[PDB]
Amino acid sequence: MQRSPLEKASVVSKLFFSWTRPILRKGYRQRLELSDIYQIPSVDSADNLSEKLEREWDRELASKKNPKLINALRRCFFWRFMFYGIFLYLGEVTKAVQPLLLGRIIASYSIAIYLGIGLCLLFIVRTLLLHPAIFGLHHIGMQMRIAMFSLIYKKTLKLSSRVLDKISIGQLVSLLSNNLNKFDEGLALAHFVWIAPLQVALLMGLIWELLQASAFCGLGFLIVLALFQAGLGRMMMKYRDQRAGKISERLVITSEMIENIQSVKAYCWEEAMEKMIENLRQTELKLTRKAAYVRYFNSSAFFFSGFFVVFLSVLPYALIKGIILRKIFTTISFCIVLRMAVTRQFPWAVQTWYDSLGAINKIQDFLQKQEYKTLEYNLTTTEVVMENVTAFWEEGFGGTPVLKDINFKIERGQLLAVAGSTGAGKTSLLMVIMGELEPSEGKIKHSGRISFCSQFSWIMPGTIKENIIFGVSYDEYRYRSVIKACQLEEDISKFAEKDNIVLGEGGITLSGGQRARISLARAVYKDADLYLLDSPFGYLDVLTEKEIFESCVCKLMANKTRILVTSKMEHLKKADKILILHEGSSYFYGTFSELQNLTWNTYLRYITVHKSLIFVLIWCLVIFLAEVAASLVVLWLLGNSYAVIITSTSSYYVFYIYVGVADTLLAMGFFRGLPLVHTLITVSKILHHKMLHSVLQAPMSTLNTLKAGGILNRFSKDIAILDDLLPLTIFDFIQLLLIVIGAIAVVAVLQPYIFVATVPVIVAFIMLRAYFLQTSQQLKQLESEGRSPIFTHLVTSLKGLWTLRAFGRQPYFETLFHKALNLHTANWFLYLSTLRWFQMRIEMIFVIFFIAVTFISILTGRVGIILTLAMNIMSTLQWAVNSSIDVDSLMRSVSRVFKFIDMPTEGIWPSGGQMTVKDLTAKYTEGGNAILENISFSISPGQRVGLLGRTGSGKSTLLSAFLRLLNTEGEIQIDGVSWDSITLQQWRKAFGVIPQKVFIFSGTFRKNLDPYEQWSDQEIWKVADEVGLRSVIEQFPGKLDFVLVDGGCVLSHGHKQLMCLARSVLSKAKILLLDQPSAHLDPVTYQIIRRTLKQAFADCTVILCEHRIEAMLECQQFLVIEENKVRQYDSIQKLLNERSLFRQAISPSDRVKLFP
């Protein structure tokens, strides 16, 4: 990463942007390598930028009664903003004085050589004044966006738990996405809000020089046009506000359904998901089309006022006194500049100010939210004391408190066991202790140092070692002792690079017990006064749980204050204190002694998506050609008081007025533009549908390589550019191309020498564009790819917020966010610099060619007229060449969308339910190690099978291999029907599967239980009562109509397990594949699963995986996974007698049941 060459660039080198020549050469010849990227300047660093803005905003907050972020932004960049605006205005005056000089030349036809030299000198100054100032404005905008992004992230980690619930990741990601690249380049257009009125005043004086008070009619026409455009912009801002919330909701749902894709595939819910997304897109697209209709009219004002302004300006003068055609010809040159200023530069600047002030107001609104607070003592005894503590989940109710008068006291070094049934408030008690839930009555008192292990494991991107260390120094002895105690040596040995294997966020490649043990190891590794643990042994088998409980809790952490949630009697035996809760009330508190007593291919693909687009383009081309023919015959007809036309002189001026009106003669009306934007917005709808379908049909081996931030990137930014930015960019490019072509045809016949000179310029522009785009496309692709790490870090940090706050690693996460910000900044800065170089060089070619043409014309009557015509043609060519670069920039998102669309595809009878398996081998990757090898067994119809094995052995791998969700190789048959014979949909429809990872999406209770809307509320209530969900469901304001958010955050773990059981009961399948249905349930609640298994699945084949022993009392066949091989048994007593350690680890109640 070589230091930026801009650092040691000379004054002339910085002025002409000539330090970008190396990167251009390298990109032109070869594909860019990593070593070709340069370090960001030391001014653009996120750390320093955010530190400055934080100082100014912190001063504003305390100082003022009405803090506003605009004052802090003013104090950081006001003088640089104005500095660049001064030179911008200076360069805009040159565009206004140039017509004056042209008119003096025309009227004069020795003075004309001096006039030509001065006109040629104006071009040079305009180039050295505008391009350096425009780039300085883009730099200010970039620095403002970085500092605002850093302040937002630092606020996110301080948000309160009560306000967290309402803020969604969709809203968070939409905020950043809107101003990601827009805010930076909006800075250049802002100064025109005051520059344009001054240009109007100067131009009005210069037009009074000729037409006296007659110019005020054209001025009034332009004023009415400006009021019309203001109304149009006001109307445009209305729809986008309506659309924002729908967009955020769509993003939330798409992200959740992509995260739980294996559950979606197992349930065969792809069609319901697609239907929901299409329902949201209909509503969004209705407002998108309305906004596009309005923006078309706003963008057609410049091209339709051309004839009207000139005609109105000269008409009163002509009606009072005879006018000469020379004056009429001279008025068009001023009118072009004035129209451009009134109908294009002023309204765009006003819209820029509106959007920027709105974005800054939204950011301030976010920055003034409610924050997290807590209290502790350094002089405490390292005891934990709770005194009559009552807690309310909802702040408004504090209704029914979740906890009521909880009392407990523990001195340093003793254990406190916390028992109770589902929904009793154990996790809530831990939350109150952590300070995330503020009590309504009572007070908690401990020392601040706390270590937490959540009931739902959290994982972050990086190696296993990085996860355990979590941001502190690496201690070899401590790390090895913790690894040994947590029983992770056996499992880490299997990995290729040991613990150095990189883990995807959320631990997608690990088993549930492995994720639980990694989280436990992280907590054990941290040194703290208190250790909060929530169901750490839930996903583990009995022998592993016993080993961890003895070696990690009762040996490794003997002299630590500890709290442990457990429902096991063996675990309650060793606890110094016991606290039994029930429905948020202290049923019991005391010892166990007291309890016992009790490329152009992209352009082609885009154009041919929809037939309507082809028809519309053909229609527009046909009408263009008809207009060109009409103009030609009209010119031929003219060839063969109110006005003063003489055959001797000024008869020639007529044709040149006609060419002067070409901008309005060739403009697209509402019969050619509205259909063209409508059809492009149809193309966008089609592409989004295709992309979603491909993603949902892709194989898992392909889906497990994607990053949540990358999929969010593609579904948030790319879709928006196609929906809004691309349609009107293409409209403007088409308009400019048409005008240029028609003008070239008509002007060649009048003066041939203009045509034989326009082509050299066109050739030079084409060659330069082709040279530039080779490198600019590679920089654009890099920039587009640079946003995924930012989105991914945002998603991960929002997922692990309670753990981050509990441990205290906020500085570490802020550092990593700044790293990703700098990564995006490097590529964005390089892309903007190369773009400025290209535009500066295009202007230099224009200046050179005009100098040559003007000097040759002066060396060799109609010279001034020909100069005017030439300048109009060349300026329109430059405008079109810049619009083409914009369009090419926007087509890279089309290419990315097509890349995601081109993903590979994944790939009566159910009666007895009999199943045969023969020589089955399963792996996750081609050329990878086989998790299972040489499987073979048989299952009789209507029989119960118990699947057993140590954590991380391949039970979920076998259940996935049944559904063919990974690489499979063998023969499985059901009722004598091979899985090869029938389609994958048919094969998967015969299984009722309960996944180990629960999938709750954002939507109503009955939608969560029934996405296809086939069952009736009576049957749904019957099933809900059948699985003990009536009480839970009827505790919310909407019974079956309450909307769950944040993946069922208002539900407990056991409640989610019961919802999955209810889904499986609603499905009526002959074969059932259950994957640990009782994960964190107490034996009382397990009676539900027992009754349901015996009654609901009365005549069905059942393959039950479960680490619980009582469940093994309800099975006849047994399949034990060991060393990648499954051994078959028919008696659990025979199975246990062969294994000593497992039988020794069986609890006394379990062995009382097994052996009576």
Ligand SMILES: Nc1ncnc2c1ncn2[C@@H]1O[C@H](COP(=O)(O)OP(=O)(O)OP(=O)(O)O)[C@@H](O)[C@H]1O
């Ligand atoms: N964020 C929340 N907002 C509102 N209510 C909640 C929230 N989280 C849990 N609850 C409710 O508070 C009660 C206590 O739930 P909690 O998670 O503390 O139960 P638990 O005893 O830990 O259960 P489990 O044994 O399933 O882990 C439940 O009725 C639950 O629906």
Ligand SMILES: Nc1ncnc2c1ncn2[C@@H]1O[C@H](COP(=O)(O)OP(=O)(O)OP(=O)(O)O)[C@@H](O)[C@H]1O
């Ligand atoms: N997507 C994956 N890619 C590669 N290896 C995987 C993937 N998922 C799981 N594994 C590996 O397969 C092995 C078995 O995992 P599996 O989830 O089948 O275990 P399990 O016996 O069901 O464990 P648990 O009792 O924790 O549910 C583990 O070593 C795990 O790391």
Ligand SMILES: CC(C)CCC[C@@H](C)[C@H]1CC[C@H]2[C@@H]3CC=C4C[C@@H](O)CC[C@]4(C)[C@H]3CC[C@]12C
């Ligand atoms: C040909 C004769 C009759 C007309 C003369 C018109 C006069 C008023 C015009 C011609 C050139 C103009 C100046 C050109 C450049 C600038 C620099 C700018 O930063 C402020 C306006 C200012 C200072 C203009 C003021 C008006 C001006 C002096």
Ligand SMILES: CC(C)CCC[C@@H](C)[C@H]1CC[C@H]2[C@@H]3CC=C4C[C@@H](O)CC[C@]4(C)[C@H]3CC[C@]12C
């Ligand atoms: C905002 C700034 C830049 C523009 C100020 C407007 C200036 C340039 C305008 C306002 C009044 C105008 C003058 C009005 C009348 C005449 C008489 C004419 O025989 C020569 C030009 C001359 C002298 C004009 C020159 C330009 C002028 C001075």
Ligand SMILES: O=C(O)c1ccc(/C=C2\SC(=S)N(c3cccc(C(F)(F)F)c3)C2=O)cc1
């Ligand atoms: O600074 C900028 O971006 C910038 C600068 C200059 C322009 C000039 C333009 S636009 C347009 S239309 N015409 C025009 C007018 C009458 C006739 C013709 C014909 F027929 F010859 F093509 C073309 C121009 O002269 C646009 C933008």
Ligand SMILES: [Mg+2]
């Ligand atoms: Mg819990």
Ligand SMILES: [Mg+2]
């Ligand atoms: Mg598993």
